[PDB]
Amino acid sequence: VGMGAAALDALISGVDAALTDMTSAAASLGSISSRIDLQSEFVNKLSDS
Amino acid sequence: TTMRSDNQALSAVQDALGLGAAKVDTAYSGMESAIEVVKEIKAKLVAAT
What we know:
This is part of a larger assembly, with 2 copies of chain A. The N and C termini of chain A lie far apart (66 Å). The first copy, chain A, is 90% helix and 0% strand. By secondary structure, chain A is mostly helical. Chains A and B meet through helix 1 of A and loops of B. It is classed as structural protein.
């Protein structure tokens, strides 16, 4: 409500930075999930052996 | 994901561009009307000299 041009640009930049950080966090979570899947299949193979 | 976000931003910019084009068109129509009226005024005055 009545921020002005400079405040709007600062808010947009902050929102974009937060989006980038949270996208990085999502990528990290996906990597963790992939590592969990690999660990599961390796543990199954080791138990079978 | 970053490029999809940028695409959404570009769509918003497209909507803003349409709004601004409408504003400029209205202002330019008003400008033509004012120019025609002032030309008529000048013609009347040079007749009245």
